[PDB]
Amino acid sequence: MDKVQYLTRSAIRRASTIEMPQQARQNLQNLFINFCLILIFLLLICIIVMLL
């Protein structure tokens, strides 16, 4: 790596934050529900496997 490091930095930062600063902020919300889903369900799936 040597050029793909700065080329990528400007590929998303100067494209996904200047053209969709209002949408990207709202879309990022999906990261919260996804983690919370996998974070709370990873425990429930164990209740049935540890009993049946």
Side-chain angles (χ1 to χ4, degrees), residues 20 22-34:
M20 58 180 299
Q22 300 180 180
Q23 179 64 298
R25 179 178 298 181
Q26 300 298 299
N27 180 60
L28 180 61
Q29 296 179 179
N30 297 178
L31 180 60
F32 179 60
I33 187 293
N34 183 184

Side-chain angles (χ1 to χ4, degrees), residues 1 4 6-9 11 14 16 19 24-25 28-29 31 33-36 40 44 46 49 51-52:
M1 56 181 180
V4 60
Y6 79 106
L7 293 179
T8 301
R9 178 180 179 298
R14 302 174 77 293
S16 294
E19 298 300 300
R25 179 178 298 181
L28 180 61
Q29 296 179 179
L31 180 60
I33 187 293
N34 183 184
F35 179 60
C36 179
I40 301 180
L44 299 180
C46 180
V49 180
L51 297 180
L52 300 181

